[PDB]
Structure 1
Amino acid sequence: RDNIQGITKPAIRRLARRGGVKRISGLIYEETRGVLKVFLENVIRDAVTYTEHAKRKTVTAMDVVYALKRQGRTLYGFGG
């Protein structure tokens, strides 16, 4: 519960600065939280489905790798 509100405004600030964003409006943060949430929804749904067919109650890094390759947002680094 409420770990969606565990997203801090200075973290959003830091992401804007590495993102290169200078000026920050105030109506941004919860919109950011909602987009991040829907993203992670689709991600973990697909990863857990890959693990559903895996017949193992633990999800691996490889699972999340394969699932994000399925979305085409494909990330290297951890093998897969």
Structure 2
Amino acid sequence: RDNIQGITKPAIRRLARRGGVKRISGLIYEETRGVLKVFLENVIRDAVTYTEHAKRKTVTAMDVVYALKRQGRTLYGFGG
């Protein structure tokens, strides 16, 4: 449990650098965790809800693609 804080700080630092940032502050990681919590919440609710409407308890790859397309995040290379 408590894997929201379990996200490694250097991983968020690498993502921020890949966002083209030269100096990385120590409070960036926690803000990233807080934002990513809700960002994952929205997409997980969408995809699992698509799965639930089809009377399924196991989410496949296609429902993720459908939910992302509805939200405006169509993903290539994984089908869709």
TM-score scaled by length of structure 2: 0.92
Q: CA deviation at 1:21?
A: 1.2
Q: Is the 8 A contact 2:50 2:67 kept in 1?
A: yes
Aligned Cα RMSD in Å?
A: 1.0
| Runs of 4+ off more than 2 Å | none
- CA deviation digits over 1:4-43, x for unaligned, max 9? 0111111011112222211011121111001111000000
**What SS does the corresponding residue of 1:4 show, helix, strand or coil?**
coil
Select between 32-41 and 20-29 the one with higher mean Cα deviation. 20-29
Question: Is the helix fraction higher in 1 or 2?
Answer: 1
Q: Is the 8 A contact 2:13 2:29 kept in 1?
A: no
> What runs of 5+ residues in structure 1 fail to find an aligned partner?
none
Q: CA deviation at 1:55?
A: 1.2
Q: Give distance in 1, aligned partners of 2:5 and 2:31.
A: 12
Give the length in aligned residue pairs.
Answer: 80
Q: CA deviation at 1:60?
A: 0.5
> What runs of 5+ residues in structure 2 fail to find an aligned partner?
none
Question: Is the strand fraction higher in 1 or 2?
Answer: 2
Q: CA deviation at 1:3?
A: 0.6
